[PDB]
């Protein structure tokens, strides 16, 4: 039941620079291993037996460690390195894993491409009414979405979901769904979603 601690849980890196991720153990261990998990796929082995590169892993990755302190270093960060990194030990039962450190890649601020969609006729027939807004390919991750119905902000019934950072352009995308009842929807005409950060990108439609 060896506890592997990875801190900070989230680190930020600039393109081309070197960064080191650490893993401390609650008990001395002979070796440490490291996995990389990218969006939508299972963990992939990066380093085994503390410092050995797994097949197909770029040489910009390296590892070192001993006792209760181990680390993983990326010589020069690339966009494709946006992922979660986990340490792991199997020197003692039960085999255990660190909580993981997410590596975020820095880039230029970018406004999102916003698209708003009214409830489909199909959903209306079922008695429901969802209004959807996509905020695609923006940066930084922290963005605020605001829904307005007939010019007034609507806060309740909103579900927001962010994608993992993109491996190619280092941007993020988010989906915001405003859930109303069909009658509620039919009681108003103007629907708007605003994307703001620090100026905003606004899209809207009239039910009629």
């Amino acid at each position: 039941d060896i506890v592997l601690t990875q801190s900070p849980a989230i680190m930020s890196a600039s393109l081309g620079s070197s960064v080191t991720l650490t893993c401390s153990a609650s008990s001395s261990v002979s070796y440490m291993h490291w996995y990389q998990q990218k969006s939508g796929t299972s963990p992939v082995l990066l380093i085994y037996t503390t410092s050995n590169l797994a097949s197909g892993v770029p040489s910009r990755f390296s590892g070192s460690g001993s006792g209760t302190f181990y680390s993983l270093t990326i010589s020069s960060v690339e966009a494709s390195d946006a992922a979660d990194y986990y340490c792991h030990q199997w020197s003692s039962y039960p085999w255990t894993f660190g909580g993981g450190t997410k590596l975020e890649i820095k880039r230029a601020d970018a406004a999102p491409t916003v698209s708003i969609f009214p409830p489909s006729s199909e959903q209306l027939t079922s008695g429901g009414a969802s209004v959807v807004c996509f905020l695609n390919n923006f940066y930084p991750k922290s963005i605020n979405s605001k829904w307005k119905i007939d010019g007034s902000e609507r806060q309740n019934g909103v579900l927001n979901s962010w994608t993992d950072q993109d491996s190619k352009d280092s941007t993020y995308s988010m989906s915001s769904t405003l859930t109303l009842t069909k009658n509620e929807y039919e009681r108003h005409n103007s629907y708007t979603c605003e994307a703001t950060h620090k100026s905003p990108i606004v899209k809207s439609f009239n039910r009629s």
Binding site: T113, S120, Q123, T179
Partner: protein, 221 residues
């Protein structure tokens, strides 16, 4: 290359049983130890089981010992995980992995993990998703973004593709969010305005747990 494919996941009531399978290829299965691992809904990685090359020895963490049994049928090049007396703490995406192995003066940890099979332990019944097309309300752009809303299903997961998978570029499938005990998810795809609606764009959604398959055409309003 080495390939492991898990199957057998599903929704099971607490206290129930489920048997997972893992078909292996790309290496001599019989000469390798094998393991199971899992990723919890909180995204934590956990080791689940380990088995010797011939099946004569098995190891487990205390969390599943006595309830889970890892086994293998070398003749079928398949690994199994029989789960019983399932608990909510067992809900997770289960992965098949090659190893771990002692060799070449090196210690090789579990590798070549499969993409996994999902298991949800809950007393709630399965609910199929309602799949709705998202088409622009109002053209004013050289690129048009279309979407698919996969609403009110249980449990996770669902699979979403565009045009049977032939359309893979410019896609963003978002993580599902829970509301009133049901999950809702969406996916967007951006294509050249000259390709839609002059041509067809369809969202293909599958929800295995409810035997649901939907191929929703996105048509202009």
């Amino acid at each position: 290359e080495v390939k492991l494919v898990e199957s057998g996941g599903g929704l099971v009531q607490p206290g129930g049983s489920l048997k997972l399978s893992c078909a292996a290829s790309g290496f001599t299965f019989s000469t390798y130890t094998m393991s199971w691992a899992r990723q919890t809904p909180e995204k934590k990685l956990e080791w689940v089981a380990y088995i010797s090359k011939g099946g004569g020895s098995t190891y487990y963490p205390d969390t599943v010992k006595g309830r889970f049994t890892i086994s293998r049928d070398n003749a079928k090049n398949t690994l199994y995980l029989q789960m019983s007396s399932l608990k909510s703490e067992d809900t997770a995406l289960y992965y098949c992995a090659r190893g771990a192995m002692f060799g070449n003066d090196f210690k090789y940890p579990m590798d070549r993990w499969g993409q996994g099979t999902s298991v949800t332990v809950s007393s709630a019944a399965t609910t199929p998703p309602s799949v709705y097309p998202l088409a622009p309300g109002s053209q004013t752009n050289s690129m048009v973004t279309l979407g698919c809303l996969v609403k009110g299903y249980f449990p996770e997961p669902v699979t979403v593709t565009w045009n049977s998978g032939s359309l893979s570029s410019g896609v963003h499938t978002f993580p599902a969010v829970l509301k009133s005990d049901l999950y809702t998810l969406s996916s967007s795809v951006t294509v050249p305005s000259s390709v839609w609606p002059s041509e067809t764009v369809t969202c293909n959604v599958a929800h295995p747990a409810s035997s649901t398959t939907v191929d929703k055409k996105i048509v202009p309003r």
